[PDB]
Each structure stands twice: as C-alpha cells, then as structure tokens.
C-alpha cells in the first residue's frame, strides 16, 4: 500500500479506500473479515455506506482491532441534502458513534446540496460535533461544480468526485483546481459504466448524454491485465486524489485490488488514452455550432 496527505489534515489515507455498504449475504463475522484483510493489506480508510446492524457490529469490532488514530473513517450520509435536521444528528450517534464504537469521524460526506446553504439546524449541529472533537471535516459529493460560498464554509474540506480514463476535460479541471485549494479529493467510480460491453442499465446522470467511448477497446487486448485493473491503475496515477474508492465483497477480490497499487500501467497505455482523448476532442470540435449564433438562437424563445 501506498499512503497520501488527506491535504491540510496531517493525516495519511491509503490510496484505496473501502467502501462498506449493506450486503444481506454477509454476516459480522464477515464485515469483520472483510475489514481485517483490507487492515493485513494496508488499507486504513474506510467509507461506511449503510446502518444494517450486521455490518457496524462486524466493521466496529475490526476497527477496534488497531489505534483508532491509525484509521481514516468517512460516513456517507445520503439524501436531499436540503432536509437534513436534528433525527439526521441522532441517526449519526446511533450507527455512525454508538454502532461502530466511535467518538469521533475524520468526515462526514453529504450530497451536493445545489445552494450555498445547509439548513440551519444541521448546521448548527455540525458546529457542535466539531467543537467536541467528533466531527474533523464535512465532505460534498458532487459531478458538478459546487457552489463557491459551500467549498468556503469552514466546515467543508472536502469533495468526493467521479474520475476514470472516461472522465471529461470540464471533470478533470474541477478536481485539480479543488486539489489546488487546499481540499481533499476522493475519487469515485474509477471502473464507470460507460466502460463495460461483453440488460437494462439507468442513465440519469447530468453528466450521462455528453460522453465519448470510442478507443477504450486496449482495455481488453492488454496482456497480463483486466480492463477494471487498467482503469484502477490508471486513477491511481492522478496526482489530485487523495484517495480512490473501491467496494469490494470477498478477501481475494481485496488482495487483487491492493496488488494493483505496486503494480505500474503497462509501458503503451498512457500513450493510448492521449490517441483516445485527442479522437474525443476533434470529435466535440467536428460537431459544435458557433457558440453565439447558438445561444442567440436558443434566446428567441
Ligand atoms: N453513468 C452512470 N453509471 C451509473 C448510473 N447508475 C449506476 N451506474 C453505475 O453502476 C454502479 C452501481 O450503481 P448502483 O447499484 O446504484 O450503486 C450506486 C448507488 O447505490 C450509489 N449512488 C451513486 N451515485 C448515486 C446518486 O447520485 N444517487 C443515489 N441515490 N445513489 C447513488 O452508490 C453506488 C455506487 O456508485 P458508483 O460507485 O458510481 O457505481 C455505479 C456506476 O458505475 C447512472 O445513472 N449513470
Ligand atoms: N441509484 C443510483 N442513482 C443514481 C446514480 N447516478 C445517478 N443517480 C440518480 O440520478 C440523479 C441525478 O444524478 P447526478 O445527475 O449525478 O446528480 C447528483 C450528483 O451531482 C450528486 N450526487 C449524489 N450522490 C452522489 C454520489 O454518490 N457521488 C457524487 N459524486 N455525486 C453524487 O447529487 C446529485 C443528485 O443526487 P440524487 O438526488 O441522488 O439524484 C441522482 C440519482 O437519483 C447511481 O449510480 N445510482
Ligand atoms: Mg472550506
């Protein structure tokens, strides 16, 4: 395992970070598995995503297995984030303190709201958490650009982003220029949709209509190496993350992804994203419209 600055805190994350979410197949014991392979393969952040009671039982004794000061914990917390109160505060001290055995949480990771604003309430009960040292940083979720007067709000240090080989210019800018400014960044969805072929499969992202996939296909006709291990690889190279979010259900599938943190991208690939990107752009270029033209159009109804 490699180790990164979680930038501004002094503290060092794991260049993986596991993700924990609900998995009714699984039990304590194997949370508690789970957890301890990825703590044997150097893995010390952790992204707690789901309440089943099985799962903070299993997870919060594998954590009490190490120095809490050793461990990264991160809390996603979902939701329109607009109506989160007081019974989301008193959630958090049932599963997120009491349920993993915890008296404080490096970041808490909310939705974009899509404002500069909390609500009052939430807030207030955040500021109270971190005067207590239980709360060491808000974090925002978003594939978009969050509202400047959030990312100015003291509470946020944080920002947690998609980043693949798929991922746009307008992307890769928005998390550089957040690295750059002092906020940590964690990488989602480094093996995204758009890159898997050989059902019925949702598309609602903004960010979904807009994007190229032509000349990924050295995904698969690379020796020695599955396109999700490229992909991953690949993230690990982007110098503004502090950190890559994987899920994984099984020891093995933990190993396979820690392997690929010492492994280095085969000697041709770096060249081949630039031949797929510079496709990407003339491609973007070779159907635009004249950017006032247009708009001036559009106005006029
Ligand atoms: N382009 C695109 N890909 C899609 C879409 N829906 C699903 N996928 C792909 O399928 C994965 C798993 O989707 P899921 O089962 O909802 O699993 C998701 C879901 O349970 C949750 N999640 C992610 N984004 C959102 C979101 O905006 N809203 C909600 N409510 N849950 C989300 O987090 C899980 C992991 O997200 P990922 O790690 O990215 O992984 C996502 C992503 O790779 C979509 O509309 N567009
Ligand atoms: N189950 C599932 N649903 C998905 C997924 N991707 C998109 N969606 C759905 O599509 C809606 C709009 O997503 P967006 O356009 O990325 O807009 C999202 C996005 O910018 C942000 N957001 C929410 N969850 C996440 C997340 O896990 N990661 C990031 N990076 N942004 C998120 O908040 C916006 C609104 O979130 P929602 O109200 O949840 O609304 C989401 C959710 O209903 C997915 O993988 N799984
Ligand atoms: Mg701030």
Redesign the pocket.
Known sequence: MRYRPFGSTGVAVSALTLRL?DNPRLRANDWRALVFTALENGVNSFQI?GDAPELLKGAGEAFASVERHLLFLTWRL?GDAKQLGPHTLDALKRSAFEGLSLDYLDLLLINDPQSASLPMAFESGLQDLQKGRALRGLGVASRGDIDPGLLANDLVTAVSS?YNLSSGWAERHRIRQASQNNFAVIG??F????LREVKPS????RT?PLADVGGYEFLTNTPGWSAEDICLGYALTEPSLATV?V?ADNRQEIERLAAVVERDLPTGVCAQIEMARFSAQEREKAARRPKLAAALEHHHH
Do not use: K
Request: charged content about 40%.
């Open positions: 979410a995503d979902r998609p989602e969805d093996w995204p949709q758009a949702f598309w609602q992202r979904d979010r899920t």
